[PDB]
Nucleic acid binder design. Sequence first.
DNA 1: AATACCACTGGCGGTGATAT
DNA 2: TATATCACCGCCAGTGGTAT
Lengths: 92, 87
Amino acid sequence: STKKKPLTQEQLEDARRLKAIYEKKKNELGLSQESVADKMGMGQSGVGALFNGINALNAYNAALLAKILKVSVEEFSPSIAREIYEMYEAVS
Amino acid sequence: PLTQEQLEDARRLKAIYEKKKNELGLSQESVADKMGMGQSGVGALFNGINALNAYNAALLAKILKVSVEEFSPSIAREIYEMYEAVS
DNA sequence: AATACCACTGGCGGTGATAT
DNA sequence: TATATCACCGCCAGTGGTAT
């Protein structure tokens, strides 16, 4: 319905990429979805939604997660990385 | 209402538009066309009615030929921090 | 003319509980 | 325990129509 909009195919692949990085690294980083949520100031279901392709990433959340997982945003979402780069061109 | 800093940002932004409009041949509708939105929406931003976010601020900066920091140092800072994650 | 004003609404960005 | 999923929705940025 009207309340929530489904993600594009591209947003879906971005989420699969993100969740795989999280799985590969949650051990070495000592993470949990609940700790990630805390770091971001949301609950486990908010993070679960991003990881599972229910809610889409925005530039801000993507940047935060990249930092938490210690990767660059482009390793999961090249398109958001590029939107972030184009915004940067307006500051620099 | 928006915060005092958000209101200042809007005042800086409109001042810039007022000053460069003639040389750049702009109007609130043409700037709106350029951002994919309507005159009403643009007017709300210029007038401190709706808050600016990083994307719209970056578009506006490019349309006005200025840097984001010229109207909103706080947003410029946010932008830079996201970039720290793409680097 | 160009801009400002008004009432309104889709969908972003979540929540807590429950199921696995 | 950790995660995945479910029902649910506040809020406001942007709207189109109109007034100045």
